[PDB]
Design an enzyme around this catalytic site. Sequence first.
Site, PDB file in Angstrom:
ATOM      1  N   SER A   1       0.778  -1.231   0.000  1.00 17.74           N
ATOM      2  CA  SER A   1       0.000   0.000   0.000  1.00 17.74           C
ATOM      3  C   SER A   1       0.812   1.285   0.000  1.00 17.74           C
ATOM      4  CB  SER A   1      -0.949   0.013   1.170  1.00 17.74           C
ATOM      5  OG  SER A   1      -1.907  -1.010   0.954  1.00 17.74           O
TER       6      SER A   1
ATOM      7  N   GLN B   1     -10.892  -4.633   0.834  1.00 16.43           N
ATOM      8  CA  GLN B   1     -10.450  -5.317  -0.377  1.00 16.43           C
ATOM      9  C   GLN B   1     -11.526  -5.338  -1.449  1.00 16.43           C
ATOM     10  OE1 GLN B   1      -7.481  -6.017  -0.609  1.00 16.43           O
ATOM     11  NE2 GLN B   1      -6.760  -6.375   1.488  1.00 16.43           N
TER      12      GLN B   1
ATOM     13  N   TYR C   1     -10.223   2.822   5.721  1.00 19.62           N
ATOM     14  CA  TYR C   1      -9.149   2.572   4.794  1.00 19.62           C
ATOM     15  C   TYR C   1      -9.548   1.454   3.845  1.00 19.62           C
ATOM     16  CZ  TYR C   1      -4.388   1.508   3.266  1.00 19.62           C
ATOM     17  OH  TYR C   1      -3.233   1.283   2.560  1.00 19.62           O
TER      18      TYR C   1
ATOM     19  N   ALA D   1       1.885  -3.277   2.872  1.00 15.11           N
ATOM     20  CA  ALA D   1       2.166  -4.701   2.990  1.00 15.11           C
ATOM     21  C   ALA D   1       1.557  -5.455   1.824  1.00 15.11           C
ATOM     22  CB  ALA D   1       1.626  -5.281   4.305  1.00 15.11           C
TER      23      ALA D   1
ATOM     24  N   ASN E   1       6.135  -9.452   5.903  1.00 19.32           N
ATOM     25  CA  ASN E   1       5.118  -8.542   6.429  1.00 19.32           C
ATOM     26  C   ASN E   1       5.147  -8.650   7.955  1.00 19.32           C
ATOM     27  OD1 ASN E   1       2.807  -7.068   7.033  1.00 19.32           O
ATOM     28  ND2 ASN E   1       1.384  -8.600   6.226  1.00 19.32           N
TER      29      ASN E   1
END
Length: 359
Positions: free
Chosen positions: A62, A118, A148, A316, A341
């Site tokens: 991101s 997502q 987000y 990530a 990550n």
Amino acid sequence: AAPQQINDIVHRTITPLIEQQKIPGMAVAVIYQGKPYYFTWGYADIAKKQPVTQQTLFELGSVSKTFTGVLGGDAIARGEIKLSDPTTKYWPELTAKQWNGITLLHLATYTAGGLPLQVPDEVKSSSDLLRFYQNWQPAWAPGTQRLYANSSIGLFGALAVKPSGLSFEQAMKTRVFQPLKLNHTWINVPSAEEKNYAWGYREGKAVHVSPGALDAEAYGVKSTIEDMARWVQSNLKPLDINEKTLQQGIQLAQSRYWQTGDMYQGLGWEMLDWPVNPDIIINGSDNKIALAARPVKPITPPTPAVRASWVHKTGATGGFGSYVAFIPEKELGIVMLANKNYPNPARVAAAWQILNALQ
């Protein structure tokens, strides 16, 4: 060589981080008085014993959103889009009533009213996307809650390039990567560069990010530590950029459009006033906060970019963890790229320890 104070704080901070988090490979750039200093550790490919180098490509995850935000800023500066433009101006097939009132600003800043984190894996074509967005029901009115979301800024990026007539990738190459001489930054890694593409590691297994709709816009850029240092330099000091709309776009991506708590939402970038409370940035980076819905206050007009800011972004993928932070007033910044990550708060704590020491 770097000045010894940089070498000392980097070694003392990053060495225990790598051991604590079992990071296979890592690259760090410190931008100090505007100049970059590089550090590498470990392996890009464990089994094949390929070390991380200054040419290793990492998945930014991101952190890609910072490029999308700047590209959108450049389109604003070119007169091609306005943030107040309705989404339906650029996608008139989005006829469902919930889209009335949702603007490009809302998409860019995660404030459309609950677009999900997502894009579903099942959603792949433009037609699948249309169905997805037409069936989505908001949890809140636009401009009230920040959640987000790759499906929000991803759509912003896809629509922001429509007036140019270029694909998102072509626009990004021509308007951002090429003017800034980011010659080793890719949405799609070319065949000749696969040798430099690190593997990511998830539960010890080598992995690369999978294709997904709006991936390029939300999480799909791969880059080297050198190009990422140049990206930080460009965002630290936009007045050195010769292409006027790109200079302006960089500035607009650090305007403050919304506040929640002590954080301000830019275009891709997030900002806090400097000096920061390190606990606020460290704890706020944890997904328990960073992915939660938070109420926003509008800033009308958006605050022009504040030099005394901590400007940052985490990113990530399944196998990679990245972080970028910079302070324009101090000409100081850091990039941390790793092929695991590992938790956001550990990234931010290490970055703040390094930059606070060098301020």
